[PDB]
Amino acid sequence: VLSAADKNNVKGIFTKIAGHAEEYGAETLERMFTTYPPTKTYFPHFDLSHGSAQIKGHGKKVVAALIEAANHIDDIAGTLSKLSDLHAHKLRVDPVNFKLLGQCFLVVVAIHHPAALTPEVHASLDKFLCAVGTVLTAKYR
Amino acid sequence: VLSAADKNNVKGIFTKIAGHAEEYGAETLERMFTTYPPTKTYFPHFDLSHGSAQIKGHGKKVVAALIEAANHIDDIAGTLSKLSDLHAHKLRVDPVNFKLLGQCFLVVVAIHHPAALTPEVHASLDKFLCAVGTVLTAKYR
Amino acid sequence: TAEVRLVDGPNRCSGRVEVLHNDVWGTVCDEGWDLREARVVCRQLGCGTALSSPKKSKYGEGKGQIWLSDLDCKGTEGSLSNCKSKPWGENICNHVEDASVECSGTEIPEPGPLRLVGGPNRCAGRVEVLHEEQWGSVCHDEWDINDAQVVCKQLGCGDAVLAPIAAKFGRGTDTIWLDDVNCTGSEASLSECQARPWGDHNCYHGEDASAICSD
Amino acid sequence: TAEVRLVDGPNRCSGRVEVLHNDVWGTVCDEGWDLREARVVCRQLGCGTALSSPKKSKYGEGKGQIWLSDLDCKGTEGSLSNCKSKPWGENICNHVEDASVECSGTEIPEPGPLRLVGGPNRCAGRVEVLHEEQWGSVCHDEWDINDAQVVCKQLGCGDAVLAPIAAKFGRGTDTIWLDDVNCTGSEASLSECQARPWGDHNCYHGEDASAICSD
Amino acid sequence: VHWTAEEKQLITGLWGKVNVAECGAEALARLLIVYPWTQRFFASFGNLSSPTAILGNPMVRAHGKKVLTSFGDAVKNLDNIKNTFSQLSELHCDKLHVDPENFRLLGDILIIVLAAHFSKDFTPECQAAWQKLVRVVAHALARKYH
Amino acid sequence: VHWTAEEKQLITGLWGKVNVAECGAEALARLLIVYPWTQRFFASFGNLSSPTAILGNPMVRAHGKKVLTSFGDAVKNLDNIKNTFSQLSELHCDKLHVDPENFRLLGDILIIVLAAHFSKDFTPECQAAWQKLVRVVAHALARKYH
Ligand SMILES: *[C@@H]1O[C@H](CO[C@@H]2O[C@@H](C)[C@@H](O)[C@@H](O)[C@@H]2O)[C@@H](O[C@@H]2O[C@H](CO)[C@@H](O[C@@H]3O[C@H](CO)[C@@H](O)[C@H](O)[C@@H]3O)[C@H](O)[C@H]2NC(C)=O)[C@H](O)[C@H]1NC(C)=O
Ligand SMILES: *[C@@H]1O[C@H](CO[C@@H]2O[C@@H](C)[C@@H](O)[C@@H](O)[C@@H]2O)[C@@H](O[C@@H]2O[C@H](CO)[C@@H](O[C@@H]3O[C@H](CO)[C@@H](O)[C@H](O)[C@@H]3O)[C@H](O)[C@H]2NC(C)=O)[C@H](O)[C@H]1NC(C)=O
Ligand code: HEM
Ligand code: HEM
Ligand code: HEM
Ligand code: HEM
Ligand SMILES: [Ca+2]
Ligand SMILES: [Ca+2]
Ligand SMILES: [Ca+2]
Ligand SMILES: [Ca+2]
């Protein structure tokens, strides 16, 4: 339910990933496609090669939405309502894929900001990413 | 979200299981304990032998809570609020175990009421059972 | 030497194989069922030369007993019980797997290792190759006019006009023998072309290749 | 002959095994490390008869080169390089897996395949058995006063007084040999008792059985 | 992937009795209605606008038969399931683009269909055996994803 | 479970440089405070009352070291992992009552810990290898659950 401390830890880690929107987004996707090859299923029309312009382009969009979500954490369902129908009702990304992307995104921030990803902040991003995942696959069941 | 038709399907299928509370409940547990052996993890102190009075007693409680949810289908989170804390905060049943039990309960009603469990009613029970599952996993996600 | 009949087919010489044993007519499971068993049933009935051996209930499912399964005919046997096979009635099949056969009706030479089926005539239709005594189709990945040229010239149909993809003349039924077939055009048969090993593919019968020739 | 030493121990007859080769001191991985390699190292150093062969860096981790791995000493080799092993340097190990040794110095308890460790004296402590050149603990599943009785009489410590569970005198460190020990109480040794196969168990070292005798 | 003499006897015994045409269509239909998002993979099958239409749809009846028929290739050869579905594994990856997670869904629909049709032959031990077979077949179809 | 020569080299390569005493202590501690419902399994470890107290708890650091150490027996036999954890598989089922789904959580946390300490040596291809390793070891511990 994102207690007051979770909100500060999450916004405190998005201050050091704010500038690196395209960079961290391209790497989090390339890790998802590498460690979990089945996730490539939902991008059959993309160039999944390393350093492709599409992965770097769509990757920026991915963490830019997470950045927009970190700013408005009192209301994540409303700030990601547009993407809710895209992932749950138009693409139907199976929810276990969001756990995978959040896992890869945690790996990226652990690589570039190991000092910041202290285990208190670790527990807060997992709370945060699991809420973003729920928003993107809550209109079902 | 259990449309008016979904409500009628779910309330109608519990007409045919109403008297069979203990019978179907003990079978659902034995089914889950047999096809998914790891679910015995949360009942170490129990007698899991076939036809035990502890499986019959606990199985009767399980589907009696489902019957009490079918009546107040417009408010399921409230009618099982006393069990939400037991499963999500005290015992911490991992959510993937609720789909396993729902799978076994569907097998029970399919065996005993195959003509009643039409594909419409299947879909309505699956939405209903996912609602009961998310109520009991509400203290997280 | 037990009697055999073909049931639910267009005529006497095609349909579901049923054998007579203990005065009970039973079906034949389709595991290990290929043209070798097919031409045993076609000789025994005087029906000719066994065009194909349709697996999985092409002419419907039988009822009751399944007598034979895992047949291992050499292809010359007089009857179908003289072939190496599992004992009578001992099997794990169900009737969805009942074997069938399609004979020609008159004595003709073997059709050949290659045939176009489902089209208007001999020289236009779905490509099917004969390998390991089973007819199987060809996947339409890398399939171009050079691959249809080898099929047309081998059949004596002139040059290849088109190499239709996406199962133009209908989908095939049992086996997919070839994928990624890459001919140069001058090859003598389709087994001389570059392709994945026999049976390796990433395809289904909605993707069967075809060829059209002078016709 | 390589040269060996013991480091980071209470004395110089116990510690992390380190060997000398190409002017550089390095550690030894614990793959296949057991009392056969242990008695070789204790003999080189003049430290005696090789009480135990602790795995997994009991006396801390070395730093730098890991020379040897997968040692297969017969037990009588003059030095440690005279054994069959993986070539110098080639290993997939990590310094957490640095093997150690404990030697007697002068005083001589081996006898025999049974000993009590961690108690005030010989006749009290958890139970350890000698099997395939490794000392290992006994799980307390099914462990009663009859089982401790067989241990007491094998050691000549009189009759059994208790059979404490839950690692009463402290946990073990490497191998859990026996589980489900089912003694009648009048067996000669503990390896004559009905129990599970050697090595098989569903236990951890928080469950090592003990034995108390008089006294 | 180790089978026991009793698990084989349950899987084999049930298979020789299944009405594959009728359970395969039943199972595939229920996949399209219980999990409506799967209809996107079958847009070429025509009318899928209602549960009734999905039942009566001939291409659903036909393809559901072939899906359950392909479990027969696993039943008749149990110690070789990985190689039996090697070809179908590639197809579902790089031609159909089916998320492997859906393989779990169709199999669990199949267990409910089998349970409805077999009354008091589908024991808790029999469901344990067929859930394992579904679970192995599903892992086998996901094996060759690039 | 089939390993490639580069996958083995990626797992062997990391394993030789991992500060197991620290990574195992931090992974187990991160389990207890990212997923705090796992603290009930470790009631004997004493002070688990804060994230700072859990990092500093000596028995959390001791047990975490022995957990990452046990992946070492999987590292040194990659093509024999099932038999290596036969012992522990029975332990976690009918001695500890640990839901096998919890094995995923600890293993996925270990990947985040290894990522933190190896920075850009932990390439996506290196992560893929160790994600498979974590995932196979978790399947080995769940192989014998009665
Ligand atoms: C379909 O097959 C053709 C022909 O392949 C050639 O002949 C076969 C009988 C086999 O022996 C093949 O191994 C053999 O290559 C393939 O065309 C061939 O492609 C290669 C690589 O793309 C061409 O190599 C080029 O060669 C020249 C030197 O001549 C260099 O300039 C280039 O750098 C390059 O290496 C080769 O020439 C070409 N051969 C012909 C006859 O066209 C074709 O690629 C294949 N199709 C598919 C989809 O794989
Ligand atoms: C500890 O071990 C004893 C001894 O086991 C017995 O002797 C061994 C040498 C082997 O041959 C074993 O197979 C054999 O059982 C176990 O005690 C034995 O338990 C069995 C089963 O409970 C007893 O059988 C009973 O026997 C009589 C007829 O003699 C009947 O009235 C009963 O219905 C019942 O079958 C057996 O007598 C008993 N033997 C002794 C000497 O006590 C013991 O069970 C074992 N502990 C555990 C926990 O398994
Ligand atoms: C977990 C947080 C996620 C966020 C914030 C997110 C965000 C986005 C964004 C911004 C877009 C592009 C919108 C546009 O182009 O207009 C998108 C599209 C898409 N997403 Fe995600 N996504 C997430 C997870 C996932 C996952 C895990 C998958 C698959 C495994 C996925 C699959 C897709 C696909 C297939 C598209 C469409 C591709 C295209 O537009 O061509 N998403 N998402
Ligand atoms: C899905 C719908 C479920 C319902 C309606 C339900 C209902 C109940 C009820 C009524 C009780 C008894 C309450 C009491 O005694 O005070 C109970 C207890 C319990 N349930 Fe559930 N439950 C469900 C799912 C599950 C699942 C999936 C698991 C485990 C995999 C589980 C594990 C337990 C345990 C361990 C107990 C306590 C055992 C005991 O009291 O000795 N429950 N549940
Ligand atoms: C245990 C699970 C599954 C098995 C055994 C299986 C098996 C098969 C087989 C044998 C075929 C070829 C049929 C033919 O030759 O006509 C096929 C085709 C196909 N599969 Fe599956 N499949 C499974 C799961 C799925 C799922 C879950 C989906 C989608 C959500 C799917 C989508 C498709 C599609 C779209 C086709 C093409 C059918 C056509 O165009 O006629 N499959 N599958
Ligand atoms: C990859 C995952 C895991 C591995 C490799 C593993 C391995 C081990 C090992 C080797 C031991 C014995 C340590 C010793 O001898 O002192 C052990 C014990 C134990 N494990 Fe795990 N385990 C895993 C997952 C888990 C999880 C997820 C939990 C709880 C949520 C857990 C709870 C415990 C507990 C409580 C003990 C006993 C600790 C004690 O009392 O000293 N384990 N495990
Ligand atoms: Ca044959
Ligand atoms: Ca292809
Ligand atoms: Ca040795
Ligand atoms: Ca035991």
Coordinates of C-alpha atoms in Angstrom, one line a residue, chain B residues 3-141:
Chain B
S3 CA -21.7 -8.9 -14.8
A4 CA -25.4 -9.6 -14.1
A5 CA -25.1 -12.8 -16.1
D6 CA -21.9 -13.8 -14.2
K7 CA -23.8 -13.4 -10.9
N8 CA -26.7 -15.6 -12.1
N9 CA -24.3 -18.3 -13.3
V10 CA -22.3 -18.4 -10.0
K11 CA -25.4 -18.3 -7.8
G12 CA -27.0 -21.0 -9.9
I13 CA -24.1 -23.4 -9.7
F14 CA -24.0 -23.1 -5.9
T15 CA -27.6 -24.3 -5.9
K16 CA -26.3 -27.7 -7.0
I17 CA -23.5 -27.8 -4.4
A18 CA -25.4 -26.3 -1.5
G19 CA -26.1 -29.5 0.4
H20 CA -22.7 -31.1 -0.6
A21 CA -20.6 -28.8 1.5
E22 CA -18.5 -31.4 3.4
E23 CA -18.4 -33.9 0.5
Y24 CA -17.0 -31.5 -2.1
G25 CA -14.8 -29.6 0.3
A26 CA -13.0 -32.7 1.5
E27 CA -12.6 -33.9 -2.1
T28 CA -11.2 -30.5 -3.2
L29 CA -8.5 -30.7 -0.5
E30 CA -7.6 -34.4 -1.3
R31 CA -7.4 -33.5 -5.0
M32 CA -5.1 -30.5 -4.3
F33 CA -3.0 -32.5 -1.8
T34 CA -2.6 -35.3 -4.4
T35 CA -2.1 -33.5 -7.7
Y36 CA -0.1 -30.6 -6.1
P37 CA 1.9 -32.3 -3.3
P38 CA 3.6 -29.0 -2.2
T39 CA 0.2 -27.6 -0.9
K40 CA 0.6 -30.0 2.0
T41 CA 3.3 -27.5 3.2
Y42 CA 0.7 -25.3 4.9
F43 CA -0.9 -28.2 6.7
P44 CA 2.1 -30.0 8.5
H45 CA 0.2 -30.6 11.7
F46 CA -2.8 -32.1 9.9
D47 CA -3.8 -35.7 9.2
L48 CA -3.7 -35.7 5.4
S49 CA -4.6 -39.4 5.1
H50 CA -7.6 -40.2 2.9
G51 CA -10.9 -39.6 4.6
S52 CA -9.5 -38.0 7.7
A53 CA -11.9 -36.1 10.0
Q54 CA -9.5 -33.1 9.8
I55 CA -9.7 -32.9 6.0
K56 CA -13.5 -33.3 6.2
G57 CA -13.8 -30.6 8.9
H58 CA -11.5 -28.1 7.2
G59 CA -13.0 -28.9 3.7
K60 CA -16.5 -28.2 5.0
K61 CA -15.3 -24.8 6.2
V62 CA -13.6 -24.0 2.9
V63 CA -16.7 -24.3 0.6
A64 CA -19.0 -23.0 3.3
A65 CA -17.0 -19.8 3.0
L66 CA -17.6 -20.0 -0.7
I67 CA -21.3 -20.5 -0.3
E68 CA -21.4 -17.4 2.1
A69 CA -19.6 -15.5 -0.7
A70 CA -22.0 -16.6 -3.5
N71 CA -25.0 -15.0 -1.6
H72 CA -23.2 -11.7 -1.0
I73 CA -21.6 -11.7 -4.5
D74 CA -22.0 -7.9 -4.7
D75 CA -19.7 -7.6 -1.7
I76 CA -17.2 -10.4 -1.4
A77 CA -14.3 -8.5 0.2
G78 CA -16.5 -7.6 3.1
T79 CA -18.1 -11.0 3.7
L80 CA -14.7 -12.7 3.8
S81 CA -12.8 -9.9 5.6
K82 CA -12.3 -12.1 8.6
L83 CA -10.5 -14.7 6.4
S84 CA -8.5 -12.2 4.4
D85 CA -6.3 -11.5 7.4
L86 CA -6.0 -15.3 8.2
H87 CA -4.6 -16.1 4.8
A88 CA -2.7 -13.0 3.7
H89 CA -1.3 -11.8 7.0
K90 CA -1.1 -14.7 9.5
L91 CA -0.5 -17.8 7.3
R92 CA 0.7 -16.0 4.1
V93 CA -0.5 -18.4 1.5
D94 CA 1.4 -17.8 -1.7
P95 CA -1.2 -16.5 -4.2
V96 CA -0.3 -19.2 -6.8
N97 CA -1.8 -21.8 -4.3
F98 CA -5.3 -20.2 -4.6
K99 CA -5.5 -20.9 -8.4
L100 CA -4.5 -24.5 -7.6
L101 CA -7.4 -25.0 -5.1
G102 CA -9.7 -23.2 -7.5
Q103 CA -8.6 -25.7 -10.2
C104 CA -9.4 -28.6 -7.9
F105 CA -12.8 -27.2 -6.9
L106 CA -13.7 -26.8 -10.6
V107 CA -12.7 -30.4 -11.1
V108 CA -15.0 -31.4 -8.2
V109 CA -18.1 -29.6 -9.6
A110 CA -17.2 -30.8 -13.1
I111 CA -17.3 -34.4 -12.0
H112 CA -20.5 -34.1 -9.9
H113 CA -22.4 -31.6 -12.1
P114 CA -21.0 -31.9 -15.7
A115 CA -24.2 -30.8 -17.4
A116 CA -24.5 -27.8 -15.1
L117 CA -20.9 -26.6 -15.6
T118 CA -21.4 -25.3 -19.1
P119 CA -18.6 -23.2 -20.6
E120 CA -20.6 -20.1 -19.6
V121 CA -20.7 -21.2 -16.0
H122 CA -17.1 -22.3 -16.1
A123 CA -16.1 -18.7 -17.1
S124 CA -18.3 -17.3 -14.3
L125 CA -16.9 -19.6 -11.6
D126 CA -13.3 -18.8 -12.8
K127 CA -14.0 -15.0 -12.5
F128 CA -15.7 -15.6 -9.1
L129 CA -12.9 -17.8 -7.8
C130 CA -10.3 -15.3 -8.9
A131 CA -12.3 -12.7 -6.9
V132 CA -12.2 -14.9 -3.8
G133 CA -8.5 -15.4 -4.4
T134 CA -7.7 -11.7 -4.7
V135 CA -9.7 -10.9 -1.6
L136 CA -7.6 -13.4 0.4
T137 CA -4.3 -12.0 -1.1
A138 CA -5.4 -8.3 -0.6
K139 CA -2.8 -7.5 2.1
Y140 CA -0.1 -7.6 -0.6
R141 CA 0.5 -7.5 -4.4

